[PDB]
Design a protein around this ligand. Structure first.
Ligand SMILES: Nc1ncnc2c1ncn2[C@@H]1O[C@H](COP(=O)(O)OP(=O)(O)OP(=O)(O)O)[C@@H](O)[C@H]1O
Ligand SMILES: [Zn+2]
Lengths: 79, 454, 70, 149
C-alpha cells in the first residue's frame, strides 16, 4: 500500500508531476490539501480534469474552509 | 524530484488513529470540504513533546530518583525536589502525597476529644462505659516544653483502649473512625497493630474480637472506590508486660498463627510486633522458643526497642528474633557495627518524630547537626532504610503529615527528595504480598506536582 | 483433642499450627464440644509446649512404637 | 570468603582457627581485596560458635551439599542467620520456606554443572515436569536465584 499526500497552491501542475515520483509504479491514492482561496479554483478544476483523464488510483481534493488566505498566525495554527 | 529521506516518526505519536480525533468534512461534488472540530490534537502533541523532553532531560541519572515515574517531571521541579523541606509552605504538597503507615496503634487513636466522644456515644452498652476521667495534657502539646517520659505518655491514653474497646459498638466506632482518619490523610497502605486479647470478655473470646476488627476494616475497604482504597493489614501486639505474664503473649502468638492462614484477601494478619521491654529481664532473648513458631509458619516480626535499649537490645532482636523492622532505634549510632549490619541486611527502622520528641526530647529548629540532633539524616546517610510513622494518633495528637513536616524542624536541612525516599522505603519494607505491593506501587507513582516550583 | 504428630525428616510446621490452633479454640468454646487438650504422636518439645501449659490445656503423650522407658 | 567447614569426626580447632582468622582479616583490610564473610561448608546448628561473627558484621553463607533435607535450609535462615544458601535444590518441598526465602531476600546460589554432575537432572526437556531444574520455579516465586561455577 502506497499513498501520497500533497498540498496545492497557485501552481496546480504540482500534484500531477509529484504523482509520477514512482513513475510507472504509480500510487494507490493521492489526496490534495487545498485552501478556500478562489485563486486556486481553476487549479482545482484542472486537477479534477487530470484525475478524470488519468483514472485508476483514488483521488480527492480538500480545501481549508476557514483558511482563505494567509493573513495572521491563527490561520497558520488552523492550517 | 528530490528525496528528503524517510521519517520513522515519534514513538508517542506514530500510534495515533484517525477516529480518536475525527475530521468533519462537507461534500461538494468531487472535492471534500474538511473542517477542524477543535485543536485538541495540538494540545495533545504539545503535551506529548513536553513530557518527552522532560523524560530525556532527567533520563541521565534515573538511578537517583526514588520513583522512576519522576522522570516526567519538569527539570525545574526536579531541582525543587532537591532543596530543603519547608514546614510552612509545604503543608499542601505533603498533604497530597500518597503515604504509607507502618506504626499506628489502634488503642490510642481517639484517646481525647471529639473522636473520643464519637466513640463513646457509639457503645452498645452506654451504662457500662467507664467514667471519662480527668487527664490534663502537659503544656505546649503536641510540642512539650520538656520530655514527659514513657510512663506518662502511656498514661495519657487512659480514656481509650481496654477501658472502652471491650464494647462491640465502641470497637466498631474505633475501626470506622480510624479508617476515616487514614483516608483523610491520603494513606495508600497501613498496618494497624491491635491487641485482641486486651479487648476480650467472658462471652467474647480474643478470636471473636480479632475477627470483628478484621471484618470491620474489610467492610470499610469494600465501600471505598478502588482508587482511594487504603489496604489495611493487621499486626498483633505481644506486649512484654512486667511480672512474667505469658498467657496473653502465648494467646496472641497462637491467634496470629491462626489468622495468618484463616484470611488470604483484603485485610489480613501479616505479623507480630513483640515489644520486648528493656528491664534486663525481658529484652529480646525472651525468645525461649516463644517466637520459634511464628517464624516456623512464615510470619514477620517487628520489635519495639523501648525508651533505653542501648545497642544490646537492637542486636538481641536483630540476630535472635530475626526481626525485620525496628521501632524507635534512636541509639543505633552508638555501635558502628550495628549501623552497618542493619544497612547490609536491609532491616527497616521505624521512626516517630512527634512521639520521640514528646518522650525523649530533642533539639528543635537547629541550624546544623550536633551530638543530640535527630538521627534521621544520620541513618539515611549510612544507607539504613528509615521510615516515618505516627505511633499513636490520638495521644500524639499529630497525623502522618504533621510527623513528616516535623522532620524539617528536627533534622536541619532535610530535603523533599529524602521525604520521598522515606516513603519508598516504608512501602518496600512493608509486610505485603505481591498484590498489595503492586497496588501500593501503582498508587505511589502519583506524586502531586508542586504548587510553586520556585 | 488436637493432635500434634512428629514426622521423621518432615516439616515441623504442622506441630507449629496445631498448638496455636488449640490455644485459640480452647478459649473460644466454653459450652458443649470443646478442644480440651492436645496430643503428641512422638517425642517418645519441652520448649514448644511452654505456651500450652500457660493457657491451661492438658497434654496426653503417645508412646508410639518404641521400647524405651526414657 | 573463608570456608569454615566442619569435619565429620574431625576437630573443631580448624573451625575456631577460621572464625578467628576471618574476624581479624575483616578489620585488618579496608581497600582492595578484602575478607567479606565466612562460608559454612558443613551444614548443623552451630549457633554459639557463630555469635562472634555476627557481632562484627561479617556475612555468612551456608553450604548445602549431598543433602535432601528441608530442616537444614530452615535452620540456616534462622539460627545461624545466613544471607546466601548454596545448592539448595530442594526448597519447594516446603511451601512455607519458598515464601520466607523469597520475602527476606536470601539469595540461592545454583551451580548448573555442579548440581547436574553430583545428582543429575533431565536435560533439554521440551516441557517442565517434576524432575526439571528448579531455577524457574525459584525465579517466578520471587527468589533471588544466582548462577555460579
Ligand atoms: N509508644 C509506645 N511505646 C511502647 N509501648 C506502647 C506504646 N504505645 C502503646 N504501647 C503498648 O502497646 C500496646 C498498645 O496497643 P493498644 O493501644 O491497641 O492496646 P491498649 O491495651 O488499649 O493500650 P493502652 O494501654 O495504650 O490504652 C499496649 O500494651 C500499650 O501499653
Ligand atoms: Zn509501638
Amino acid at each position: 500500500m502506497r499513498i501520497l499526500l500533497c498540498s496545492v497552491g497557485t501552481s496546480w501542475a504540482v500534484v500531477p508531476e509529484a504523482m509520477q515520483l514512482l513513475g510507472s509504479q504509480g500510487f494507490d491514492e493521492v489526496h490534495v490539501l487545498t485552501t478556500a482561496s478562489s485563486k486556486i479554483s481553476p487549479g482545482v478544476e484542472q486537477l479534477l480534469r487530470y484525475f478524470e483523464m488519468h483514472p485508476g488510483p483514488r483521488f480527492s481534493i480538500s480545501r481549508v474552509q476557514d483558511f482563505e488566505d494567509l493573513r495572521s498566525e491563527q490561520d497558520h495554527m488552523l492550517f | 524530484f528530490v528525496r528528503l529521506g524517510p521519517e520513522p516518526g515519534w514513538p508517542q505519536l506514530r500510534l495515533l488513529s484517525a477516529p480518536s480525533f475525527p475530521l468533519e468534512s462537507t461534500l461538494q461534488g468531487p472535492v471534500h470540504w474538511v473542517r477542524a472540530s477543535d485543536m485538541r490534537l495540538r494540545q495533545h502533541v504539545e503535551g506529548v513533546l513536553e513530557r518527552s523532553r522532560h523524560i530525556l532531560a532527567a533520563w541521565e541519572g534515573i538511578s537517583e530518583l526514588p520513583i522512576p515515574a519522576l522522570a516526567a517531571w519538569p527539570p525545574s521541579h526536579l531541582r525543587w525536589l532537591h532543596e530543603p523541606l519547608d514546614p510552612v509552605q509545604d503543608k499542601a504538597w505533603v498533604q497530597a502525597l500518597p503515604k504509607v503507615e507502618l506504626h499506628c496503634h489502634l488503642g490510642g487513636f481517639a484517646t481525647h476529644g471529639e473522636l473520643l466522644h464519637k466513640v463513646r456515644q457509639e457503645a452498645a452498652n452506654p451504662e457500662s462505659l467507664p467514667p471519662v476521667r480527668a487527664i490534663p495534657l502537659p503544656p505546649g502539646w503536641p510540642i512539650p516544653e520538656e520530655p514527659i517520659g514513657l510512663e506518662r505518655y502511656m498514661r495519657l491514653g487512659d480514656n481509650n483502649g481496654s477501658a472502652l474497646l471491650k464494647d462491640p459498638g465502641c470497637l466498631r466506632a474505633q475501626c470506622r473512625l480510624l479508617y476515616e482518619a487514614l483516608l483523610a490523610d491520603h494513606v495508600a497502605y497501613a498496618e494497624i497493630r491491635c491487641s485482641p486479647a486486651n479487648y476480650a470478655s467472658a462471652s467474647r473470646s480474643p478470636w471473636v474480637v480479632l475477627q470483628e476488627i478484621r471484618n470491620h476494616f474489610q467492610q470499610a475497604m469494600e465501600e471505598t472506590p478502588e482508587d482511594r482504597r487504603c489496604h489495611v493489614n493487621l499486626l498483633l501486639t505481644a506486649t512484654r508486660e512486667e511480672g512474667g505474664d505469658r498467657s496473653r503473649i502465648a494467646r496472641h502468638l497462637a491467634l496470629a498463627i491462626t489468622a495468618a492462614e484463616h484470611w488470604k484477601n483484603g485485610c489480613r494478619v501479616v505479623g507480630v510486633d513483640l515489644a520486648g521491654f528493656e528491664d534486663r529481664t525481658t529484652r529480646a532473648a525472651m525468645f525461649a522458643t516463644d517466637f520459634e513458631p511464628v517464624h516456623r509458619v512464615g510470619l514477620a516480626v517487628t520489635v519495639h526497642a523501648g525508651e533505653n535499649d542501648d545497642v544490646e537490645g537492637i542486636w538481641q532482636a536483630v540476630f535472635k528474633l530475626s526481626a525485620r523492622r525496628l521501632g524507635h532505634a534512636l541509639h543505633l549510632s552508638r555501635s558502628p557495627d550495628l549501623l552497618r549490619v542493619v544497612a547490609e541486611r536491609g532491616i527497616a527502622v521505624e521512626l516517630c518524630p512527634y512521639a520521640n520528641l514528646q518522650i525523649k526530647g530533642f533539639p528543635l529548629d537547629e541550624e546544623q547537626e550536633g551530638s543530640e540532633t535527630y538521627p534521621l539524616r544520620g541513618y539515611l546517610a549510612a544507607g539504613v532504610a528509615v521510615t516515618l510513622n505516627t505511633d499513636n494518633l490520638g495521644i500524639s495528637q499529630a497525623s502522618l503529615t504533621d510527623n513528616l513536616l516535623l522532620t524539617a524542624r528536627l533534622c536541619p536541612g532535610i530535603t523533599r527528595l529524602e521525604v520521598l525516599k522515606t516513603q519508598v522505603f516504608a512501602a518496600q519494607a512493608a509486610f505485603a504480598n505481591q498484590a498489595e505491593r503492586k497496588a501500593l506501587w501503582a498508587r505511589l507513582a502519583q506524586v502531586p506536582v508542586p504548587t510553586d516550583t520556585e
